[PDB]
Design an enzyme around this catalytic site. Structure first.
Site, PDB file in Angstrom:
ATOM      1  N   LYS A 154       0.928  -1.124   0.073  1.00 43.53           N
ATOM      2  CA  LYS A 154       0.181   0.024  -0.241  1.00 43.53           C
ATOM      3  C   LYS A 154       0.831   1.113   0.010  1.00 43.53           C
ATOM      4  O   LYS A 154       0.936   2.122  -0.769  1.00 43.53           O
ATOM      5  N   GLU A 180      -1.949   5.311  14.371  1.00 44.26           N
ATOM      6  CA  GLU A 180      -1.538   4.205  13.553  1.00 44.26           C
ATOM      7  C   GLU A 180      -1.032   3.183  14.555  1.00 44.26           C
ATOM      8  O   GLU A 180      -0.736   3.533  15.971  1.00 44.26           O
ATOM      9  N   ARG A 181      -0.988   2.153  14.009  1.00 45.40           N
ATOM     10  CA  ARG A 181       0.076   1.244  15.088  1.00 45.40           C
ATOM     11  C   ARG A 181       1.243   1.487  14.896  1.00 45.40           C
ATOM     12  O   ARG A 181       1.782   1.769  13.665  1.00 45.40           O
TER      13      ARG A 181
END
Lengths: 467, 167, 487, 58, 66, 466
Positions: A154, A180-181
């Site tokens: 991605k 986000e992680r």
């Protein structure tokens, strides 16, 4: 001014200063908080008390604890020094590579350009990924929404995108990894490192990174968004540039806004969403544009809340979106990298009036045809082939060629592709597709067109596959 | 805006927000004691029924509650402005709250800043000093008839359970 | 005590509005006069909203709330390995006093990016399906999701059991200290669980933090974080931990409940917004770490029990947005007898291959794929028939493969076996074979290679992977074995 | 087959020790607690020490 | 407070007294017994009625073979 | 201590206790009250005011009336002399067999047995009602939750179960009629009377009745669970009994909790459902157990609200259970009786070896076949009442038969059914289906299996058809 913790109900820290209550938004620093405790004034609650939000996690605090107002909102480093560096929200190197040497600070709020500064007609931002550009001809300053199947590379694509334009056209990029992680930012980090787009030998890695992962106050994570904006604003206006603002996920931001609202005692509207969902959006989005100085082209990763987008916010978001990236796992599954959803990744700006009429026609013709082939798959699926005309066959093949021609090798992922990526000068691109459409090669293998760069090179690949 | 006097006690809101006003009022001019005292006097002079709970009827209205309690500062002789704040509790129904508002206010002189002991303590009484439990040491170490039905019996309790609490 | 104490400002609902203690820390667990603890969540203007962990019959108002002056910390050590404790970490096992006389602040930072390091590690669970299709990793998080008695717990248990060999698997980062968070789990259930664990005595390398429903809600709430602390510990002791958070569903309930009692905004779907954050911070605390830091692990198995399709439910949605993948279990399938249950199609491991053994990659790659294909067409027809042979094979095979991802409860497996048996089918061998007798085969075969080709198994294990040679043997073995299995 | 018999004998002696221990404890503690405060100076002897708190804590 | 050890004395006394007058449930009276007797039986049930003052031994044989 | 009613807002009586307060859950008696107005202290609101809950009715009350606190929660009679004595929740009779007299008194709250007290194994309770045994084979001591249509065959079943088991069963039983409509309890009573299991020459009948109907004001309804528990805890432990425990409907309790929350100055949790809900559960469910000194073997009717289980309450509920019998209203709707949801006539005391596999598998096959039959329905939806692949037809038929074979007469509702209930003791049961599964019967016809006990009788019935 010093204020006193009068109430902590979570990160709503109500502070009473018997000392000035400056305007709202002011970052307050808690005295007695050995890790940077920004409070952003949220309300002047009345009677010497302000409502704040800790932008951080709370502990140890005593009611009364002394807080000294930073006298302004949160100010953050702005400047080049962020490029190839990871800052958190507060700006602090979560690159964890020591500090970043900035001098230019900015309060993270900023505004929408005032009207006269509006470079009235946006102009295509050239993706240069042929297909991409073609179907979604982005606008310089544009908001691109990324619907998409995660981690397909991605990121690879993104990385690549940064590469493709922001290198090519010397722009800059911001990735604000919101909510986000940490892991995913981590992964990415090295991935950039790995890609070399992050260079650690150069902090002119074409991206400045800001991460405000899921562990900060929602608002704080949310505000990492502003932060990124603030920086990107630096690069646009100050660096005169097309800054790319890569955002993941604008949704998570959204959720976060809403998250504070409740607690903010608000009535946050639909879906629980902040009533100001819109205003939040508006003001930030309106910060994004193309100034006369440059562009902040915002590439916004879009998480699909409720696997839906009519979720009022995305629905709204559409208003802001102008070019849509629907990534197609199907296209990927066909091995086609680009894996984009073609006929859904579009750009409104796509016009003949605008973005060349030729381009346009070619595109529309293409879209049409691509769809038409799309139809034919369905037909053929059931009807075998050569139960039908050879014009269909021709087109099928062409479409397919075109399809393959959309496939664009990739440039750092020689490891995946066994190819090197390539970038495509626009005109020849337009030309390119038209030509294939014009079927001027009808004796060349289509597999040639697979992972081609510019159309000449596609001709080149054509040749080699044509022996 | 204004000077905000947060002298120890301080109700930390909770309807001595007047008190906090008046701590800055009192503090301004330092009619501290005067008013402190005004208030005591007033305190039951009001708080008895005597025209006062009659006047604390709802049913008499500030048509003339504004004209008889207020004009009980007039009816009395206090009010160096201490009625005016009454007339505020008057609307603001805080009249029924006042003792406590006074409490918070007072406690008395340096008494304004008292303290009563506890944990293992048996003892009742305020603390007006700086450092303390010098005095408390010397407060216990005063009498020795003393209670433990004035606080802690460390006895039933503290460790009376503890061995049990191990088993 | 001049003041080291406060008076209970108000009480009702086990929510002690607390007069005094202002001096108070933030997020101090306090002590009530009843020896009970409470937690001062809100130091709000005139009181401290203090959650009472006990019962408010016990308490009374004006009661002395004594500072403990403490934010919770938890006893830490690994002497809890071999222990069932409550949420603070106090024996509830009835094994007399605990052993974790080191203590650790529960408040622990999630690892930084640099502290983190991605996965490259597998980790196994013995669940054929799982380890195959969502090949197990360490340091992670993974939603285990499925309905009530999916053997939900069973599924987890067999995994825990699986770790036995891993604690016998002397690679230390292949020895796993197991952490079981029981959220809202009746003692009886637990008793069973434990009972299994006992039998399995996996418990020796295991903490069982057991929060039955009785536990006050914050306690229950707290417990995972606690558990979390303990695992971060291991992680930081270059030790590899497995935490199973079973179940946040209950946690959330409690947390909201708590909020509400605190008369505090909850949020979306009536649940608090930062219950996400709650968990986020919790799960951010699970990781796969740079090795430099001992690079231990805290592998997280959160569980959420679906009520079906209500994944939409905020917290599942949350979790989804958080997760590293989700294990959809298909009960229907279970009913079909397809045990493992799995809705494989929806089950995902976002990560995939880093948590995968090359071994597994070798057999699985094709299979994952095959099943995919199989599955759509699996879904097709079955209208008392099907049509073309190609696909018919895929189905036959597929069906077999389905058995291959199956496994009875109480049956965790070793990877080499797993790969092995998969290899057989993959290699198109038992697609001839018919389904009851697959099962039969599988056993027979398995005990067979174990028996005979423990040599080979040894090899494969050794290489950590099938080798073409190992294959060549395997195949050979198999073919004959197969032949014997049949004829 | 041997072990289980042994564990019973040990286990009973443990269980009986506790079952005496609590009842012995309650019986002792309920007996001598009834005295004590007749010496109020179990009270004073700590006011003594409690004063060595009131002093020697600050 | 101040008495630390003088309290422990008060507790100590009765522990010896009972021991040096052992008989029944020890000043408890029958009441301890009534529970005890059931409890001792129950524990026998967990191991069955196998005598615990005996040593067991038996022989063991053979079956069909090939 | 004493209070004065200072405020009455519904059955929340906020009593300002004139004297200092007494603990929460102190049971208060209003003095001078009409009769016994128990208020349970709920909160110490402060102001030496408590929020109390009247359990009872709040008609006729001076907002000043003096209340004397009993200083603890309830003391209620607990002792054997209760069985066949119907007490109201408040300990007191409603048997009207004069006073019940126990010597042992109780706070209706009681404890939730510890992990360490956990008796670590339970073994199948069977009923010989095929379906049960099969699908939800119970564990002796289990918390059985009858998810089930409203009072439908619920009630019936329960009674019958009681018959089958509680009879057989030499230990005691308790029926706690929670939120019941009195009439059914009257009935219930009458059955017992009739049966003599309510012996009226034994007030230590095999069954104790506690009834705590909807007609009470909330508190009473709210509290009846604690009560029932208390009695039963007595019964369980002390005499060591296996109490069989009927709670019908714990839902109606739940409903009661949920009803109060607002009024209790709380807010509930979602949909109105009380904010405390889980802990509420924890505390009740955990209050029950199956001790080491017996069992409270529980069949608790659980109304499935709106037959929706998504519904948080049941969602919670499940955890506490041992075997859940969810009756399928659809099945009921198929006229079927036993009307069960078989797939949700379940047991966590089921998983391959928690029932063992014959049954399990037989069931899995069965489950499969019906489900598959559902799947096939889809085909049929296009194709017809006699159309498909034949095999499928067999299996369908087998499913239709099986279905029928699961239908069983009712002793209780022999009145309705016209045929008295059956017992198929388990072996004959498993076997029964196993045979059908064996297709042994195949030649046989399905409706000959409808409303049968033993499988032969169905066969017999086939002859009886022609």
């Amino acid at each position: 001014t010093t204020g006193r913790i009068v109430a902590v109900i979570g990160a709503v820290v109500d502070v009473q200063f018997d000392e000035g209550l400056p305007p709202i938004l002011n970052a307050l620093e808690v005295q007695g908080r050995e890790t940077r405790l920004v409070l952003e004034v949220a309300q002047h609650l009345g009677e010497s008390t302000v409502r704040t939000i800790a932008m951080d996690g709370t502990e140890g605090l005593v009611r009364g604890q002394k807080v000294l107002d930073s006298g302004a909102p949160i100010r953050i480093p702005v400047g080049p020094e962020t490029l190839g560096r990871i800052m958190n929200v507060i700006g602090e190197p979560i690159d964890e590579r020591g500090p970043i040497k900035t001098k230019q600070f900015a309060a993270i709020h900023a505004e929408a350009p005032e009207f006269v500064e509006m470079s009235v007609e946006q102009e295509i931002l050239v993706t240069g990924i042929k297909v991409v550009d073609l179907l979604a001809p982005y606008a310089k300053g544009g908001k691109i929404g990324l619907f998409g199947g995660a981690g397909v590379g991605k990121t690879v694509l993104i990385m690549e995108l940064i590469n493709n334009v922001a290198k090519a056209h010397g722009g800059y990029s911001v990735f604000a990894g919101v909510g986000e992680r940490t892991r995913e930012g981590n992964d990415l980090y090295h991935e950039m490192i790995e890609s070399g787009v992050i260079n650690l030998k150069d902090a002119t890695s074409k991206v400045a990174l800001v991460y405000g992962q899921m562990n900060e106050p929602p608002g704080a994570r949310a505000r990492v968004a502003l932060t990124g904006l603030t920086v990107a604003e630096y690069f646009r206006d100050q660096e005169g540039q097309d800054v790319l603002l890569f955002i993941d996920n604008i949704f998570r931001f959204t959720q976060a806004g809403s998250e504070v609202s409740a607690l903010l005692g608000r009535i946050p509207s639909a879906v629980g969403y902040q009533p100001t969902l819109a205003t939040d959006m508006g003001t930030m989005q309106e910060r994004i544009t193309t100034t006369k100085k440059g562009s902040i082209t915002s590439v916004q990763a879009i998480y699909v809340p409720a696997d839906d987008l009519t979720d009022p916010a995305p629905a709204t978001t559409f208003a802001h979106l102008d070019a849509t990236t629907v990534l197609s796992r199907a296209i990927a599954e066909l091995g086609i990298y680009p894996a984009v959803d073609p006929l859904d990744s579009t750009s409104r700006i796509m016009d003949p009036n605008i973005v060349g009429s030729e381009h346009y026609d070619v595109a529309r013709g293409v879209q049409k045809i691509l769809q038409d082939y799309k139809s034919l798959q369905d037909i053929i699926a059931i009807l075998g082939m050569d139960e039908l005309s050879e014009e269909d066959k021709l087109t099928v093949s062409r479409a397919r060629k075109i399809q393959r021609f959309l496939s664009q090798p990739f440039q750092v992922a020689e490891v995946f592709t066994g190819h090197l990526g390539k970038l495509v000068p626009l005109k020849e691109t337009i030309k390119g597709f038209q030509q294939i459409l014009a079927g001027e090669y009808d004796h060349l293998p289509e597999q040639a067109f697979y992972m081609v760069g510019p159309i000449e090179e596609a001709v080149a690949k054509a040749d080699k596959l044509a022996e | 805006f204004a000077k905000l006097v947060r002298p120890p006690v301080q109700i930390y809101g909770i309807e001595g927000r007047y008190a906090t006003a008046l701590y800055s009022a009192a503090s301004k001019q330092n009619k501290l004691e005067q008013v402190e005292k005004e208030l005591l006097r007033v305190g039951q002079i009001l708080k008895e029924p005597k025209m006062a709970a009659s006047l604390l009827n709802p049913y008499v209205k500030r048509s003339v509650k504004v004209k008889s309690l207020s004009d009980m500062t007039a009816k009395e002789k206090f009010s160096p402005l201490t009625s005016n704040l009454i007339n505020l509790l008057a609307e603001n129904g805080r009249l029924t709250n006042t003792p406590a508002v006074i409490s918070a206010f007072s406690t008395m002189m340096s008494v304004h800043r008292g303290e009563v002991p506890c944990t293992v303590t048996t003892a009742s009484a305020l603390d007006e000093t700086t450092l303390t439990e010098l005095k408390t040491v010397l407060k216990s170490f005063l009498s020795k008839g003393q209670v433990l039905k004035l606080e802690v019996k460390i006895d039933p309790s503290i460790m009376g359970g503890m061995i049990v609490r191990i088993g | 005590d001049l003041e080291e104490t406060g008076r209970v400002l108000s009480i009702g609902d086990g929510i002690a509005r607390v007069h005094g203690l202002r001096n108070v820390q933030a997020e101090e667990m306090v002590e009530f006069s009843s020896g009970l603890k409470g937690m001062s969540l809100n130091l709000e203007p005139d009181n401290v909203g203090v959650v009472v962990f006990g019962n408010d019959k016990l308490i009374k108002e004006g009661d002395i709330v004594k500072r403990t002056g403490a934010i919770v910390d938890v006893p830490v050590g690994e002497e809890l390995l071999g222990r069932v404790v409550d949420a603070l970490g106090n024996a509830i096992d009835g094994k007399g006093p605990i052993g974790s006389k080191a203590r650790r602040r529960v408040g622990l930072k999630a690892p930084g990016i640099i502290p983190r390091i991605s996965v490259r590690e597998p980790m196994q669970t013995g669940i054929k399906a799982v380890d195959s299709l969502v090949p197990i990793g360490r340091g992670q998080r993974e939603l285990i999701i499925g309905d009530r008695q999916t053997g939900k717990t069973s599924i987890a248990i067999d995994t825990i059991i699986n770790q036995k060999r891993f604690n016998d698997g002397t690679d230390e980062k292949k020895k796993l200290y197991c952490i079981y968070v029981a959220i809202g789990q009746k003692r009886s259930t637990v008793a069973q669980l434990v009972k299994r664990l006992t039998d399995a005595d996996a418990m020796k390398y295991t903490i069982v933090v057991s929060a039955t429903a009785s536990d006050a809600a914050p306690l229950q709430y707290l417990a995972p974080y606690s558990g979390c602390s303990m695992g971060e510990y291991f992680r930081d002791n270059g030790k590899h931990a497995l935490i199973i958070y079973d179940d946040l569903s209950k946690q959330a309930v409690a947390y909201r409940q708590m909020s509400l009692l605190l008369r505090r905004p909850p949020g979306r779907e009536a649940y608090p917004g930062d219950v996400f954050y709650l968990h986020s911070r919790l799960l951010e605390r699970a990781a796969k770490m740079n090795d430099a830091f001992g690079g231990g692990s805290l592998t997280a198995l959160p569980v959420i029990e679906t009520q079906a399709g209500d994944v939409s439910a905020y917290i599942p949605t949350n979790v989804i947005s958080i997760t590293d993948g989700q294990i959809f279990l298909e009960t229907e399938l279970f009913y079909k007898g397809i045990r493992p249950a799995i809705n494989v199609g929806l089950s995902v491991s976002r990560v995939g291959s880093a948590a995968q053994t090359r071994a597994m990659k070798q057999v699985a790659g094709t299979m994952k794929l095959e099943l995919a294909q199989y599955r759509e067409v699996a879904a097709f027809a079955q209208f008392g028939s099907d049509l073309d042979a190609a696909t018919q094979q895929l189905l036959s095979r597929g069906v077999r493969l389905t058995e291959l991802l199956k496994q009875g409860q109480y049956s965790p497996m070793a990877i080499e076996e797993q790969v092995a048996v998969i290899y057989a089918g993959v290699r198109g061998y038992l697609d001839k074979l018919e389904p009851s007798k697959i099962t039969k085969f599988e056993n027979a075969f398995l005990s067979h290679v174990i028996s005979q080709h423990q040599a080979l198994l040894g090899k494969i294990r050794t290489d950590g992977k099938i080798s073409e040679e190992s294959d060549a043997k395997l195949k050979e073995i198999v073919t004959n074995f197969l032949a014997g299995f049949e004829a | 087959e041997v072990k289980n018999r042994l564990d019973y004998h040990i286990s009973v002696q443990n269980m009986m020790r506790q079952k005496e221990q609590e009842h012995m404890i309650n019986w002792v503690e309920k007996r001598v607690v009834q005295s004590i405060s007749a010496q109020q100076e179990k009270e004073t002897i700590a006011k003594c020490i409690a004063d060595l708190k009131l002093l020697s804590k600050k | 407070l101040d008495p630390v050890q003088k309290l422990f004395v008060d507790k100590i006394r009765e522990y010896r007294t009972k021991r040096q007058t052992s008989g029944g449930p020890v000043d408890a009276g029958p009441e301890y017994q009534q529970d005890l007797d059931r409890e001792l039986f129950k524990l026998k049930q967990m191991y069955g009625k196998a005598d615990m003052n005996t040593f067991p031994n038996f022989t063991f044989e053979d079956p069909k073979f090939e």
